Structures are given as C-alpha cells and as structure tokens.
Amino acid sequence: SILKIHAREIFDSRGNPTVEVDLFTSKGLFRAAVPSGASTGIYEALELRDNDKTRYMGKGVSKAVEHINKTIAPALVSKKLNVTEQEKIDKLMIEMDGTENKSKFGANAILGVSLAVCKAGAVEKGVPLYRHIADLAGNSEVILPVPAFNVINGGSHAGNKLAMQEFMILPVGAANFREAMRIGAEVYHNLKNVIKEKYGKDATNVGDEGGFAPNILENKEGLELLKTAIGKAGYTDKVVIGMDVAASEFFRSGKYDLDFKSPDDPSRYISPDQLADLYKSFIKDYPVVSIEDPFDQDDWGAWQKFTASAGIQVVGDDLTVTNPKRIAKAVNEKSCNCLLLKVNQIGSVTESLQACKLAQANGWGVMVSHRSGETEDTFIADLVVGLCTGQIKTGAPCRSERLAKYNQLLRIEEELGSKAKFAGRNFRNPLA
Amino acid sequence: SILKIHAREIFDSRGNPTVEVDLFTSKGLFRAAVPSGASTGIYEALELRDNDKTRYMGKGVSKAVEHINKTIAPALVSKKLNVTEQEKIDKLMIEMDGTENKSKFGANAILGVSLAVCKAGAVEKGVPLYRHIADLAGNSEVILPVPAFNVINGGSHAGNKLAMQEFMILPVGAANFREAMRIGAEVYHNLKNVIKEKYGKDATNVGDEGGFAPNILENKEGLELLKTAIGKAGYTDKVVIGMDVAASEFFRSGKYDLDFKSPDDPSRYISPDQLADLYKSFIKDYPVVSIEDPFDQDDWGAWQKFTASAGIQVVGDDLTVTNPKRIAKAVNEKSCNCLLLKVNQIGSVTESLQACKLAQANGWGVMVSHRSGETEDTFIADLVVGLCTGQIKTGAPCRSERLAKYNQLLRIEEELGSKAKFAGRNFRNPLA
Ligand SMILES: [Mg+2]
Ligand SMILES: [Mg+2]
Ligand SMILES: [Mg+2]
Ligand SMILES: [Mg+2]
C-alpha cells in the first residue's frame, strides 16, 4: 500500500541536519523526522553522518537520506507491503541493512521510514496513532503519563559548570494531564524568578532542552533551586524530583569527574562509591524518586550495588540503549529497574516496542524519552500513551520541539474525554 | 463549508499559554496556533490574557478560547461561509468584535480562526498554502525569501545587559534557500565557538529566539562577534547583518537607555541624535544593511530624519504594528522604508495582506516575522512565499519553533522544483 517514499535533510532543534521522511499511501502524506542525542552512549545504533568537514562541520545526513531514496524506498514500494504491517516492514529494512548496529543504512535512515510507516498504518486502520501503537504493543488500555520536565540543564546540554545533565520535576499528584502541565509551567516560571533573584539575569538563559542554565557547580544547589521553586509555586505536596546524571559523559577511566567542564584535573575525580554517597544524600534531603544513568554505561558493578540499596526508580539509558540484548543483561544483573525508551537508540518502531515489552514483562518501569536534539515531530507523545508506561520526559516547558509533544499529549487527553486515565502516583507502573 | 470550529489552550515556546484552533470542513481538520511577542508595541491589537494571577502568572488564555468556542464558532458555522472567502470571514469577525483593537474577543482569538480558515481554503482549492495566499494577495509569482537569523539575543529576549534586541545574519549571497540555511547554520555554529573562546561556555546558552546570550553590554561587540563568525565560517562574501533595536523598550521620557536592564540612572541616557550617530558608526564599521525600530514607536521625528540619512533599509515594527492606518502615516512622512509583518499585531490574515500591499505599493520592502513567543505552527513560511516579500526573520537556526518555519521553507523550495526562485541579494524588492 506504500505508493511512494522520499527523504530529505532538515534541521533539528540545535541547528544540525537530520532526516525527515515523506511516505504516501492512498490515504495521503505521512511525515516523520528523526531526533539526535548529544550525550550518546557508545552502544547506540549508528547515527550515520556524512563527515564532510566542509559541510555542517561533518554533520550532514545526505548519505542516510540517499540510502532511503535510492535503496529503501524502491524496495518497500516494490514489495507492495501494507503500512499496517510494521514488523514485516521493519524486519525487511533490518535484513536489507544486514548489520548488527544498522551501520550500512544508518539507524537514522531506517527509523525515519519506520516512523512514517507507523503513522500511515494508524490512518489506514482509521484510528488515532496512540491507539495503533497500543494494538502493535498488545495493550488494551491507554493512559496519560506523568510528564518529567527538565527545568535546569547541565552536563553536555548547557554551557555551565553543572556536571549532572537534567534536573526534573514530575507532577505525580496532579489530577490529570492538563493540571500536570499547569504545575510544570507554573513551577518553571517561578524557578526563573528564584534563579534570577539569587544569581542575576545572566543565569536565566536556557540550555538545549529548555531548562535554565545557571552557572553553578553544585548539583545539590540545582536540587535546592527546584525545591524552592516548587514551594513558591505552592505544589510541594504534588511534585517529586527526577534526575538524569548522564554519568557516561564524565566517566574518567573508572572514576567520575563532577567538574568535567573545567580544565582537566585528576585530583578532583571521585570513586563510584563516593558518587553513590552523593546520590544517597540527595535522596535523603529532597523528594528525588528517580535517577537515570547514575554510573557509566559499562560500570556494571556500581549499578547493581546502588540499585540493590536504593529504594527508588533507577533508569538505564546509555546502559541499555533501548536494546533488548543490553536490557536482558540488565534485568538478570538487576542493574536498574526502569528503561529510558529512545526509539533512535535501536532504530525501529518494532524493536522499540520489543524493548518496552521486555522491560515491562520483567516488572521494570519505562520512561519514554526525546533526544536533546529534537524536531517538530510528536510521535513519542502517542508512543508513551499507547505503550501505557505512565512516564515521559520530553523537555522543560520551553522550546517548541518540547512543547509540540506536551501540546499533543493535551490533545490526546482531550480526545480521550471523560474516560481519560492519568498515571499520577502510579507512574512507576500504571498497570498492577 | 465550515462544519466545526473548536479552540483550546496550548503552550508557546516560552511555556506560556496561547490559542490553538481546530477548524473542520468536509476536506478535514485544519489547525492553527497564535504567536505572542515580548517587546510588544503599545499600538498592537489586543492580545487577551485572563489576568488570573493564580493561574499561569495571569497569562492563561481561556477567555480568548471561550470567545471562539461560545461566540465566533457558532456564528461562522451558522453563516455557512466558504473557507476560501478569507476577506468576508475576517470582516465578519472584525464586525462582530466591533472594537478598534479587537479587545472584545482579543486579537489572539480572531487571528487563530483567521489562520485556520486560510489553511482550509488552500486545501479547499486543492492548491498549496503559499499559492492560496498568493491568490488572495493578487500575486502570480511566488519566491523563497532570504532568511534573517537572529543569532545573538539581547533586550527583552535574553538574560544579559545587551540592550539591543536582535543581531541577525542574512545570507543574501546564497545560491538558493537550502544553501541559505546551510550558511546560516554554519555561521551560527562557528559563532558558538567564537563566543566560547572569548567569554567561556557560560556565554553560549540561548535567549528566547535561539540566539546566544553572551554576558556583554556593548552592542558594537555583538556586531563584532557576528563579523568574526562570518569570516571564520568563510562567508564574508555572502553574509550581511541586520539588527532589531526595539528602541521602544528602552525609551525614557524622550531619551534612550542602552543599559536599561541595569538599575536605572538617567545620567546614562542618550538623545535620539546620539543614538542615530551610534547606528551610523555601526553602518560605517559593519555590513549592517538593515535596522528595525531604531527609535521609539512614536518618536516620528527621529525616524524620518534617520531614514533620510542612513542609506539603508529601516524597518518599522512597533512604529507600524502591521496596521494600515499607522503605515499610511509612515509612508507619507517617509518614517521608514520597510514593514515588519506580524499577523498578530493586527489580528487577521486579510488586514495583514492589506498592510503588506500598502507597503509594497509605496516602494517599501516587507519582512515577514514570527514573534519571540512562537509555536510549532508554520503559517508564516507559506505567507512570506505567497506574498513574495523576499525577506523573513523567524529566528536563529535553533529551537524548533524557529526551524519548523525554516524546514517548511525548505519543503516549499523543494516542491517548487527547478522553477523555484530565491530573492538572494534582491531581498528588498525580489520582483524588480
Ligand atoms: Mg544521554
Ligand atoms: Mg540520558
Ligand atoms: Mg518587538
Ligand atoms: Mg521587533
């Protein structure tokens, strides 16, 4: 039923080239774009870049776009495969590439087509995208997730000293998704005043994901700022905190550098035990219920040890790279208890759904996520609703590559009407 | 032909509520959202806010949304008007409001419907949106504009002392629009390095429009940084500079405060002649070919005098507020020679086309513009192409509420194919 496929190079939220794909069926035009991370784990599927230093400093994706236009498209159009057959189409592309990490076509090439196919399939079935995703995942129910707003940005997403990547607020106590958005927005604007009053205007600019970028070095101060803003907005009893440390970014041959954005000096590196002690104090002093990538993507011993004594949600991101094989190892070792789901870390809609079901079958929570490099595409909004994970992180309530997702979730809630369910306090596992 | 209209509150790029409208015809659903400025001139049509300080700091727009749902929608649905009749529909709404500045419904309520009607009209005719706009404007030819990227932010859009609002680069020398995008992005990325090297990473976070927000005070330094980035990127031959002073933001009882973000002190204020000479020095030392709002919105004397002696494009923004009545006075006094076109400053597509035509008929250039508070809506991309103005400013190539428009422009150029035209160095008057 695929009449035509055409790919093109567009710009992501950081001004870098990325892949966009147009797919046509008798039902019309279906478009999707591909996100790109900044703190990408070594095990992520290959994001194929041109590496032509004269063009976009080597970041062009004309090669990936060409693999689609010259190879994937003609093949998919010939096979006359129906758009509702996501798995068959994804497997075909995976077989055509033939590599473990999608290094021939590029995961960005295959995902772009994979996403466009998924949207087309939904329309073909005459049902909303989230309902289509739900059918593909075998879910009867659908639910609105608690949003996790990254309101203070650090690490590789901002020009400050702050080593840890993301400081998030989750309105688990909200009555529904629209109130969750209200809480998120009001806390964010109050936080702007709190930071301005304490650090000045120069501290109120934003990072890649829309969070403020005060030039502080202390991660604890970031948490204190959140606590103050939450209090000022009056939602202390409805908001908990989440963090993405992105520890692989400051891993230094066994130790960790919490001041990695300053000229290198080994005298300040700390051990994973010392790093864990810091997390323990955070959990003690603030309502931190979730920590993502607390250690390096392959520092397996530290992960197991911390999760065993933590009491909270521990999210694997670079550890698991939305990859069934890495996830399975993590489940067996009890490395963590939550999967960060990033479709472009594995490269296809089908594999992403398999990663999600694998995590869930093992009792893990799943948090759907954007990449620091986003586009106006809103696929993940329907994805998290259809997969019923109950949690999604897709930015601070600032910069439209983030609001496009939150806005779409508002539209999904409205469409669901009075029967719309919201994860709320059951965000870790809206099932049970 | 309008079957249903339903409005809702969504979020803009700053995380503030704004209006979104869904409009249905037998051809389907058409959706549009409304932008919101920060440095808004006093003569702009009313952007209606709820002013309930307990909700979104007083910035909700539920009243505007209600004006559409309980008043405008049923009126339009009853009249059974054809969506291609833009002028009749806009006029009906203007008449229903009955006020000079659309303060009964709010310009945001009227514009939301106006835009959605326009999008439905194009599909009704089975023609691309820019073509429909071309038709409504009475244009046969269509052309890609030169993009003006606000790559360094100041004034009310950034956290720094920098008083002047926007520092833009225009790749007038590009071969086509896509190369214009490539040049814009490459210079932007080179600039991040130039700033980082001189002021450190903390100076590379971004303001509301995606431009870097360095901690500097001197506007000349802003220009100097752009020049360095342009040279470093190797495009000194293809890039010129534009500025948006937004002088109305620092107008102080007759004089001007170039440090208005620091604690007040009249002793630092300068006179309009001093400000005019400062611009002239800028025009002398840098490739500045365009300056927007060099003086206060009602400092008519200074405008006329400067426009007559500067030798460059002088853009009226808060001076004209996309208002034919203000524009008429400006043409008669030769207050400026270019119109900044902001649909939300007047409130309807029709008045916007009228304002554009009035300016163009008088030899004025016209630069289509976004607002500092944007959404994922891409209407102005088709608008500038359909109006053949030859120039558009819709942000730095950072933050998707900006790239959504640029990406759409890339899709239009692609769709136009071999017969695509680009204003290039003739941006001020693309159709000779
Ligand atoms: Mg990461
Ligand atoms: Mg991460
Ligand atoms: Mg302004
Ligand atoms: Mg302006």
Backbone angles phi, psi at B78, to 5 degrees: -70, -45
Q: Alpha-carbon distance B239 to A118, whole Å?
A: 41
Tell me which DSSP letter residue A155 carries.
Answer: G
Q: Which of A181, A213, A376 sits opposite B404 (nearest CB)?
A: A376
Query: How far apart (Å, rounded) are the C-alpha atoms in residues B45 and B59?
Result: 17
Contact between chains at A159 and B261 (C-beta distance less than 8 A): no
Tokens of residue B402, six digits: 């900006």
Of B56, B166, B12, nearest in space to A401 by CA: B12
**Within chain B, what is the greatest distance between any pair of CA atoms?**
64
| Ion ligand 2, residue ranges at CB < 5 A | A 244, 246, 317
* CB atoms closer than 10 angstroms to residue B166: 30
Q: Cα-atom radius of gyration of chain B, to the nearest Å?
A: 21
Query: Which of helix, strand or coil describes residue A144?
Result: strand
**Closest among A305, A258, A312 to A290, alpha carbons compared:** A312
List B25's β-bridge partners, or say none: B28
CB atoms within 10 A of CB A26: 7
Distance between CA A209 and CA A394 in Å, rounded?
A: 8
Distance CA B208, CA B199 (A): 20
Specify the DSSP element, H or E, that contains A209: none
- Residue A80 CB contacts under 8 Å (≥ 6 apart), including other chains: A1, A2
CA distances from A315 to A369, B180, B199 (A): 12, 41, 36
**Resolution of the entry in angstroms:** 2.2
Structural domains in chain A, sorted by start:
1-126 (3.30.390.10), 127-432 (3.20.20.120)
The C-alpha atoms of residue A143 and residue A146 are separated, in whole angstroms, by 10
A20 contacts A34 by C-beta, under 8 angstroms:
yes
| Region at B56 (left for phi over 0; alpha for psi -120 to 50; beta for the rest) | left
| C-alpha to C-alpha distance for A152 and A208, rounded to whole angstroms | 10
Residue from A21, A376, A413, A416 whose CB has the most chain B CBs within 10 Å, to mutate: A376
Set B59, B261, B342, B405: catalytic member: B342
- Token duo for residue A11: 């710009």
Distances (CA, A) of B298 to A369, B275, B279, B314, B335: 48, 16, 19, 15, 10
Under 8 Å between Cβ of B14 and B103: no
| Best mutation target, A13, A54, A412, to test chain B (most B CBs within 10 A) | A13
Nearest CB to A201 within list B160, B196, B200: B160
Show Cβ contacts of residue A63 under 8 Å, excluding neighbours closer than 6 positions. A48, A49, A50, A106
Within 13 Å of residue B198, how many CA atoms lie on the same side as its CB? 14
Maximal C-alpha separation, chain A: 64
Cβ-contact B179, B144 below 8 angstroms: no
DSSP state, residue A253: B
Upper half-sphere CA count for residue A370 (Cβ side, 13 Å): 32
Closest C-alpha to B69, from B5, B19, B140? B5
CB contact under 8 A, A13 and B400: yes
CB B144 within 8 A of CB B382: no
A317 alpha carbon to ligand 2 midpoint, in Å? 6
Q: In Å, what is the CA distance from B279 to each residue of B155, B245, B268, B294?
A: 16, 10, 17, 8
Identity at B224, one-letter amino acid code: E
Window 209-228 of B: residues touching A by CB (8 A cutoff) are 210, 213, 215
- Enumerate the β-bridge partners of residue B150: B168
Do the beta carbons of residue A379 and residue A392 sit within 8 Å?
A: no
Beta-carbon neighbour count of residue B95 at 10 Å? 8
Closest-approaching ligand to the CA atom of B37: 3
Binding residues of B for Mg(2+), by number, are: 39, 244, 292, 317
- Whether B39 and B249 have beta carbons less than 8 Å apart is answered as yes
Alpha-carbon distances of B184 from A108, B196, B198, B203, B406, rounded to whole Å: 24, 18, 21, 20, 11
Give the three-state DSSP class for B417.
helix
Q: In sequence order, what DSSP letters do the residues of A370-425 get, joined into one string?
A: --SB--S--HHHHHHHHTT-SEEE---S-SHHHHHHHHHHHHHHHHHGGG--B-GG
- What is the CB neighbour count within 10 angstroms for residue A254? 11
CB atoms within 10 A of CB B192: 20
Q: How many contacts, defined by CB atoms under 8 Å, are there between A and B?
A: 142
Rg of the Cα trace of chain A?
A: 21
Helix locations, A211-290, DSSP H: 219-233, 272-285
Specify the pairing of strand B391-393 against strand B365-369.
parallel
Q: Which ligand is nearest to the CA of A316?
A: 2
Alpha-carbon dihedral angle through residues A195, A197, A200, A201, given to the nearest 10 degrees:
70
Say which DSSP state A71 is in. I
